Amino acid sequence: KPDSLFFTDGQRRIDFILVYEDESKGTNEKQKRKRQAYESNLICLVFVKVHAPWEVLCTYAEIMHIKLPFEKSRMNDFYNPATRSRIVYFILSRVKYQVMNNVNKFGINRLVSSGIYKAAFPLHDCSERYLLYREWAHPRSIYKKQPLDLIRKYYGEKIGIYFAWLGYYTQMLLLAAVVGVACFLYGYLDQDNCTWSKEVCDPDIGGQILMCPQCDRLCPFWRLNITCESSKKLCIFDSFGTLIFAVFMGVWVTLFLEFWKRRQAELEYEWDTVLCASAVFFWILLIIASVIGIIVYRLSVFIVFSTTLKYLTPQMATSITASIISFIIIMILNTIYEKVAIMITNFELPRTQTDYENSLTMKMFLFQFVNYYSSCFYIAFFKGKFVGYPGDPVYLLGKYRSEECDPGGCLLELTTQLTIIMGGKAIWNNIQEVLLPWVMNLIGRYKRVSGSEKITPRWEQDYHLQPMGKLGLFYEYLEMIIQFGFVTLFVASFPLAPLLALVNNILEIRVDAWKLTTQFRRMVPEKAQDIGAWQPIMQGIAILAVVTNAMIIAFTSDMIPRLVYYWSFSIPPYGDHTYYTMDGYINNTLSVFNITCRYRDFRNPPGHPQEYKHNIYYWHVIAAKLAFIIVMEHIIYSVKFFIS
Amino acid sequence: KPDSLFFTDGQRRIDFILVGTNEKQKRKRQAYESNLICLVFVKVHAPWEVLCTYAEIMHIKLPFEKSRMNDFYNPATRSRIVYFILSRVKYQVMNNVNKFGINRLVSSGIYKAAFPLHDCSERYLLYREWAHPRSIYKKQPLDLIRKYYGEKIGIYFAWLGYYTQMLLLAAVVGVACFLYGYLDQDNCTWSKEVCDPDIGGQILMCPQCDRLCPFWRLNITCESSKKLCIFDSFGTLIFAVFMGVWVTLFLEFWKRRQAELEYEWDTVLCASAVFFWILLIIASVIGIIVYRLSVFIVFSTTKYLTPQMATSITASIISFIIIMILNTIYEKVAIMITNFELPRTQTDYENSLTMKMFLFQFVNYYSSCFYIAFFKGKFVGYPGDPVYLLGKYRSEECDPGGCLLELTTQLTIIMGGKAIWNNIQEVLLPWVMNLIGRYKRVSGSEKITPRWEQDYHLQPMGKLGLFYEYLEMIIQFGFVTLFVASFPLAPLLALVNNILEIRVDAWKLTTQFRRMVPEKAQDIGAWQPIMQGIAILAVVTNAMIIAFTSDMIPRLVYYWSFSIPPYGDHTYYTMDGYINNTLSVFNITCRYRDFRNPPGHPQEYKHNIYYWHVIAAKLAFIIVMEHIIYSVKFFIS
Ligand SMILES: [Ca+2]
Ligand SMILES: [Ca+2]
16 A cells, blocks of 8 residues: 555554665675664664554653643643654664674664665655645645644644744734835835935936046946936935834844743743854855955956946946856855865764754854855945045055945945845745755656556655755754844845745745655654754844944945934034925035045045045034944843843 | 750750730730740740751752752751741631731731840851951851851852952052052143143133132142042053953853852842832932032132042032931831832842832932033033023033042042941941940849840841842942942952951841841842843943043044144144143133134034044944943853
């Protein structure tokens, strides 16, 4: 029978499979009779079946305290196919191989690494798999609520916590999405009567500003008018779409953390749930330097691409193409890091599985942080600075100049990077997660055995399925923490970032689910009280996110400069208006340059006693930026103090 | 037998002592002692069997071999066990009137007193080598305190330990910067040009008050500016940075010590009324400053005793007296409002009492210091018009030094004067009241005084025993970490203080007060969150003290970016010409302290580039120092 969950005699559900074949140079007999006696003490091509009867599960459940299934009691009570796999795995790990020459091994952790065995896994049916396939696997059930209790009871506590965290995620990124939509409509509608994003488009005030080339050569004296196509759509990320949006984002990120702490407490109430500087930091410093190589490649790309060539402005198509190239390079370099972190972690002598995975987290998460967010931090914080008296950039300790931004507090490049990285990867990781299992399963089914007997045993089909590995949910937490960082660190621009995430996760909460019910082999239902080794990382990300949001609003949003302009530079002090009006902002902010243009920085005109040194406007604006940072951060940690 | 801790039979030590409407409580107390059986001095004793029987509920692990109570491998714990037995056993009636313990019994007034008794031994040696003026510097046997006076007193004297041993490092760093500020005093152009009449005495000021104040000169500042040098020349920066690192160090260092002692020992409507009085005292600090002004204004009409030294001392003493009187009033009112609300058990009641009285004392003490440090000498504009505080009364203005001598004088007189006065009461009140009792109740005994009689004549300690000591020491901690930029000797002033206090309290805990029940405690309790909040606020307030009220960042700015060919006619990083080129001119139709444009700049009396540069430096300094400090404590923890 193809749907055989039992033995030949029947009435005995299979709990595990392990496969090996050492019948056939010279050394083969050694592992042959190593594994020949290994199964002997475990007793209470052929697929070695492992089952745990009542008297075995009862006698080996005494070691670990697990609340059996009304109400529950500690270790003993009276009123689960999932826990059998974990019990069998624990039995395999505890029972060792006894010899007479002092070479003792326990479990197959070392056995499968050497190569004695081939594979080991539990198996499920073809029931709870179909009912979970219909409303939870296929993307048609977008709005259907998931049975997280069923997920916990079927695919283990770790997967249940991962999905509940994702279920809780879009449960309250919909409010962030609707706030983003409100800011979206405010920015889009109020593109006319605000003297911003209309001055730039108007050829009389924001069109007569003759800039000067940003780089050394092969750039002409452009005009601000060309900014129109990207300035009219800039206000959506500016104005009220920036200040209250990011303040609400900070309050939200500080509050739902504690809200999900309460959710975790509720879950615990429901379920039981009871030399360093070198090499390691050397490679991180090397990639901190290698972002320079990445941007050098990016320039070497678009310099040629500009000569090669829906209102596709140069700074839109160029930025999109550059972001795609950088994303491809980031994926390749992430593959390189996936190799090197593993190759350096096993070099050190680690502790058991828990500490090994904790160290692997502490290394790979930082590797991915510096791999992904380095470019975003470069563009956001220290990209378009350092222009002085003769217009001399820092030159980066060489003969190569630095790149300069646009008169908007360059954020369109940042939001394009966000959209193409966290949005492009959203497509691409799902593409691999859906298609790689199909293509490899088809390769196995069309290259190993073809034309079966029309009755395929369950173990054979499961063996043909892809393994899940010990780093099962590590990669999902990694990608989701990357999404979390992109949706909380840089959420000042792109108000629709959670919404772009929202539907994303609604697909993922199915797609992953789908790949967890049809593609990968069933995983042992491990028990965990939380996400683990990521929650402190989440707290650190939130603490850094408050500061980085303040720095995004101040140093690279050009919102504080306009607030300052219509509060203190528009009034009769420093100005000629009557009340808080934003008129004349663009002309009365940019500073003049003498070639012997008008660049973006705030500096004195050529002939002030302090020429090309910062003026009163710059110092006022930077004092306002620092005050805004201090006030917002203090208010945010005060708010989280009230919350927790 | 005056030294008799046993009954007539002997070999049975006393473990505790307790001593038409009248008939009601007479009958209630007559049957109360009946179920407890296993002026009269009821000697409650606990044999071994009752100790084992009713010590099982409160799990205590004590042997050598610390495994569990029921093992086969302490005069202190008998009092606690007897107290627990008294509290658990209730009085049974047939009218639905059930009372357990004497917490309600002594409140009504059926009994008079209840206390354990100690020896006249382990108390004599502990008086000599630990509680005597001849043994001040001798090392503490903290075990001899833990097993004799209880976990609470032991934790109090161990937490006070590091204020005597490793507060010495802070004190010696303070001494080092104290001597550094006095040696490099002539060759810094600061506090020398001020004392030089040629360039620092020609700067005529203008009156700070509306009337009865003449146009003075900076020359008179000399006697207070020359000694100001040690407070802010260069020792303030490294001093406060080291203080922040030091506090964010010993917090976790004492966490480690707490873990070590855990290894050693077992240790098993709101907006109104409550916040209304706090906002009322926030307003009443205005009344306090009005009172101090009214005092020294008249005193002005009445060893280089400059007006701003004698005045700052006299007004500080008057404010300290008023603060003590108000603290008595708050001790009354917090108790009178806390019992109004229906509280939980004793632990939660004392937690609420902590949360109320600590805030009351915070606003009582640190409000004046925050007023002087942060928002005292500001708000001068175009015609020299102060904010007037929503009235016809002007505000008070500071001196061209980033007024800090007033702040350090307030610290020295408050945390130093109280350091004397609290010890004075703690030493003399027991003597005077014991003498009153011994010379007014019974005189001329028969030369044999029973132990219980002498103990009864001693003062009671109460349920709020160590609450006041934690309160005063947390006040000292706040004064030595919040405002530790000036007065580098503040730890050293504390140090000997603590070295005396760690005896004085010790002394008063072996001769004056009645023995206290050895309560079970694993930490100071309900104060560690307060200490963490104090440290987090302390980093920020130290940054604001260095920036907004130290006049140090302006001194960095002058010789970094104003003594260079832009903004200055110099050639290096030199402090020359700082005083003249910082204060801004005022036109009456003087030269005040704030940084504003001269009378005739297109933005007249609006702020110049100097103030905006200095405030940008201040904000950058605050941000950088705070970020570095929490990064450092992240590395530490
Ligand atoms: Ca995924
Ligand atoms: Ca004391």
